[PDB]
C-alpha cells in the first residue's frame, strides 16, 4: 500500500511516507527543502547505490523503516 | 469421604476448563475465518464471556483445595 | 504418607498448569487492549496467591514470575522491567527499562519456540540451540560475552517470551504504527 | 536452509539499522541470482584520521554452517595495513571460531570492529610485512602510503 | 536537575536509566552487565567515543539527559 522511509542526514533522521509506486524524486526534494539545502547539493544512497530520480521504492524492495543515507558535495 | 467428593469435584473443574479452551479456540477459528460486520464482534464478545467463566472456574478450583489437608 | 504427599503436589502442579493455560489463552485471544485486562490479571493474581497460600501448608513455580511481569508485557511487549526494586534510596534505578528485540539471536528470525538457558538466562529459539548443540554435547553459550558453558540439557520452555511474542504479534495484528504523525506523506 | 534464512533476515535488519557511511549487500552470481553467502561491504574511515574520506571494500564469505562457524572477511588483493594479510584477509577476535566468535555477533558489530582496527592497529600481532615494517620504522611515510590508499578508495 | 536520563544500548536491546549525576558509572556498567547476563571484562563502553572509566561520574563527562552509552564486545585484531 504505502511505506515508511527513514532518511538520515548523519545525525537527524527525518522520516517519510510514500506510495510504493512513487518516483523517489519527490522524497528527495521533500527532504532537501525540509533542510533548505538545494537538491543537486545532495546524494541519496541505499545499499550503497546512488538512487536515481525515476526509481520507485517498489523497484528497490524497500519496506517499513528502511534507511536512506543522504550525503553532500 | 469429604476429601473424596472434593477430589472428584476438582477433576470436574479441570475437565470443565479444558472443554472451555476448545470452545474458545474453535470460535477464535470461526473468527480467524473473519465471519457484513456484526457476528464478528458478537462471536468475539461471547468469547469474552467464556474467559470470565475460565477465571471464575480457577477461582472455585483454588479455594476448593483448602480442603485436602 | 509419602505417596499421599507427592500425589497432592501432583494435583497442585495441574492447578498451576491450569492457571498457565488460562493466562496464555487470555492473551492469545483478547480484543480490546487497555486497562480492562487489569481486572483480568487482578482476579487471576489473587486466585494464584490464594492457591499458593493453601499449598504452603497442605502436602518456585514460573506461573508466579509470569504473573508479576504480565501487566508490563501488556503496555509494551518489548519492555525491559524496572526489575531493580528501589532498595531504600537506590539512586540509579533502572527506570522505564526500555526496548529489547524479539528475534532469536541465532535464527535471526522472530521466536516460534523460546528456550531459556538456566546457567545464564539467554533465550534462544529451540531450532537455534538444537542446531547449535548438534554433534557437540557442550559449547559456550551462543550469546556473546557469556562464559557459562551449556549443553542441550540446560534449557526449559520459556513462557515469558511466548507471551511477549504473542502480545507483540497481536499488538500489530490491528496496527503497529498506523499513520505515524512523523510520517510526512509525500504527495 | 537455516543459514540461508538467517542471512535473509540479516539483510533486512541491515537495511533498517546500519552505521552511517557503511554499506553491505550480497552479490549477484552468474545467473542473476543472489548469493546470500557472499557479500560486498564498504567501511568508511573515521574522520580526522588519515583513513578519513576513505571507504574501503571488503567481502564477506559465509560458510554453509553459519552461524556455527563465522565468515571470512577480505580486504582487496594487497591492502596496506599492519593486520590485513597480503591476501587481504583480516582476522578479528570476534571473527574467530577458535577465539570469540558467537552466533549473536551482528554484522554491524563486525564492520564497526574492523573500522576501529583501521586507526588502532594492534602491533602485537602483525599480519603483513610492508605495513608493519613502516609502522615501526617510520610512520612518517607509512602515513603517506595510508593517505594514498585512503584517497585511492573514494570512487 | 540532579538526576539524568541515560540510554544504554548494545546494538540489539537498550536500557534506559535514571542516575544521580554523582553516581560513579561502576554501578551502571555492573547493572547493564549483570542485567544482560554478560561478563564485565568482555565489554567496553562508549560515551561519545570515549572509553569510559569505571569510577567516573556523569557530570565529569558533562552528560545530559537522553545521552547514549554503547556497549560493544571488548575485542582485538592480529
Ligand atoms: Zn549464556
Mutation site, D17, D104, D106, interface C, largest C CB count within 10 A: D104
CB contact under 8 A, D10 and C131: no
How many angstroms separate the Cα of D148 from the Cα of each of B44, C53, C75, D80, D153? 69, 75, 55, 10, 9
**Would you say D68 and D110 are in contact if contact means Cβ atoms under 8 Å apart?**
no
- Inter-chain contact C80–E17, Cβ cutoff 8 Å? no
Which residue range(s) make up the domain with D38? 1-155
Between CA D33 and CA D62 the distance in angstroms is 17
Q: With b meaning 16 or more CB within 10 Å and e meaning fewer, what string describes D100-122?
A: bbbbbbbbbbbbbbbbbbbeebe
Strand partners, E16: E7
**Facing D25 at nearest CB: one of A10, A47, A69:** A47
Query: A43-46 and A66-71: which strand pairing?
Result: antiparallel
Subunits next to D (3 or more Cβ pairs <8 Å) are: A, C, E
Rounded to the nearest whole angstrom, what is the distance from the C-alpha of residue C140 to the centroid of ligand 1? 7
- The resolution of the experimental structure, rounded to one decimal in Å, is 3.3
Closest residue by Cα to residue C81 from E13, E11, E21 = E13
Helices (H), E1-78: 26-36
With contact defined as beta carbons under 8 Å apart, do D84 and D57 qualify? no
Largest Cα–Cα separation, chain A: 34
Active site residue D91: yes
Could you tell me which residues of chain B have a Cβ less than 8 Å from any Cβ in chain C?
10, 14, 17, 21, 24, 28, 44, 47-48, 51, 54-55, 58-59, 61-63, 65-66, 68-69
Please give the distance, rounded to the nearest whole angstrom, from the Cα atom of residue C146 to the centre of ligand 1. 5
- Find out whether C110 and E32 touch, Cβ atoms under 8 Å: no
Cβ distance of D15 and A47 shorter than 8 Å? yes
The distance of A17 to chain C (nearest Cα, Å) reads 5
Q: What is the rounded radius of gyration, in angstroms, for the C-alpha atoms of chain A?
A: 11
The reply to whether omega before D67 is within 30° of 0 (cis) is yes
| Contact check, Cβ <8 Å, C91/E43 | no
D67 close contact with C: CB closer than 8 A = yes
The count of structural domains within chain D is 1
Q: Which of C108, C131, C143 sits opposite D9 (nearest CB)?
A: C108
Residue of chain A whose alpha carbon sits nearest to that of C182 = A15
**CB neighbours of residue A60 within 10 Å:** 16
CA distances from C49 to B58, C54, C73, C182, D124 (A): 12, 9, 20, 44, 60
- Is C122 annotated in a binding site? The answer is yes
H helices of chain B, in order, are 2-32, 38-64
Nearest in space to C59 (alpha carbons), one of C99, C90, C13: C13
In this structure, chain A runs to a length of: 73
Ligand 1: distance of its center to the CA of C6 in Å?
Answer: 34
Residue position matching grid coordinates 502436602:
C59
What does the alpha-carbon distance between residue B24 and residue B30 come to, in Å, rounded to a whole number?
10
Kindly list the partner chains of chain B, i.e. chains with 3 or more CB atom pairs below 8 Å: C
Question: Please, are residues D18 and A8 in contact by the beta-carbon 8 Å criterion?
Answer: no
CA B63 to centroid of chain Cα atoms: 17
Amino acid at each position: 500500500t504505502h511505506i515508511n522511509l527513514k532518511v538520515s542526514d548523519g545525525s537527524s533522521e527525518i522520516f517519510f511516507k510514500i506510495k510504493k509506486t512513487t518516483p523517489l524524486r519527490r522524497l528527495m526534494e521533500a527532504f532537501a527543502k525540509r533542510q533548505g539545502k538545494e537538491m543537486d547539493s545532495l546524494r541519496f544512497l541505499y545499499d550503497g547505490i546512488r538512487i536515481q530520480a525515476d526509481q520507485t521504492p517498489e523497484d528497490l524492495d524497500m519496506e517499513d523503516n528502511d534507511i536512506i543515507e543522504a550525503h553532500r558535495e | 469421604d469429604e476429601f473424596l467428593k472434593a477430589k472428584e469435584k476438582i477433576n470436574e473443574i479441570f475437565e470443565k476448563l479444558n472443554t472451555i479452551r476448545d470452545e474458545v479456540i474453535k470460535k477464535k477459528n470461526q473468527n480467524e475465518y473473519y465471519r457484513v460486520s456484526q457476528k464478528i464482534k458478537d462471536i468475539d464478545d461471547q468469547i469474552q464471556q467464556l474467559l470470565l467463566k475460565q477465571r471464575h472456574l480457577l477461582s472455585k478450583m483454588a479455594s476448593s483445595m483448602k480442603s485436602l489437608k | 504418607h509419602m505417596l499421599e504427599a507427592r500425589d497432592l503436589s501432583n494435583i497442585y502442579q495441574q492447578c498451576y498448569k491450569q492457571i498457565d493455560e488460562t493466562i496464555n489463552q487470555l492473551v492469545d485471544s483478547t480484543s480490546p487492549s487497555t486497562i480492562g485486562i487489569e481486572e483480568q490479571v487482578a482476579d487471576i493474581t489473587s486466585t494464584y496467591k490464594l492457591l499458593s497460600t493453601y499449598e504452603s501448608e497442605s502436602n518456585n513455580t514460573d506461573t508466579l514470575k509470569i504473573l508479576k511481569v504480565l501487566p508490563y508485557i501488556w503496555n509494551d511487549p518489548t519492555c525491559v522491567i524496572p526489575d531493580l526494586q528501589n532498595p531504600a534510596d537506590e539512586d540509579d534505578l533502572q527506570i522505564e527499562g526500555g526496548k529489547i528485540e524479539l528475534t532469536c539471536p541465532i535464527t535471526c528470525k522472530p521466536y516460534e519456540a523460546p528456550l531459556i538457558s538456566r546457567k545464564c538466562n539467554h533465550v534462544f529459539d529451540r531450532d537455534g540451540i538444537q542446531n547449535y548443540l548438534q554433534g557437540y554435547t557442550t559449547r559456550d553459550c551462543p550469546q556473546a560475552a557469556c562464559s557459562q558453558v551449556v549443553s542441550m540439557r540446560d534449557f526449559v520452555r520459556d513462557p515469558i517470551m511466548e507471551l511477549r511474542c504473542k502480545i507483540a504479534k497481536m499488538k500489530e495484528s490491528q496496527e503497529q504504527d498506523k499513520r505515524s504523525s512523523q510520517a510526512i506523506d509525500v504527495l | 536452509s537455516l543459514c540461508l534464512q538467517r542471512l535473509q533476515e540479516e539483510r533486512k535488519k541491515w537495511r533498517k539499522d546500519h552505521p552511517f557511511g557503511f554499506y553491505a549487500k550480497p552479490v549477484k552470481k552468474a545467473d542473476g541470482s543472489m548469493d546470500l553467502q557472499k557479500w560486498e561491504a564498504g567501511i568508511p574511515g573515521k574522520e580526522g584520521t588519515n583513513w578519513a574520506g576513505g571507504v574501503y571494500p571488503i567481502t564477506v564469505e559465509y560458510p554453509n554452517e553459519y552461524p556455527s562457524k563465522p565468515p571470512k572477511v577480505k580486504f582487496p588483493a594487497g591492502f596496506y595495513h599492519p593486520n590485513v594479510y597480503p591476501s587481504g584477509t583480516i582476522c578479528l577476535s570476534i571473527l574467530n571460531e577458535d577465539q570469540d566468535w558467537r552466533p549473536a555477533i551482528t554484522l554491524k558489530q563486525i564492520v564497526l570492529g574492523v573500522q576501529d582496527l583501521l586507526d588502532s592497529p594492534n602491533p602485537n600481532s602483525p599480519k603483513q610485512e610492508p605495513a608493519w615494517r613502516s609502522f615501526s620504522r617510520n610512520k612518517a611515510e607509512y602515513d603517506k602510503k595510508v593517505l594514498l590508499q585512503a584517497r585511492q578508495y573514494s570512487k
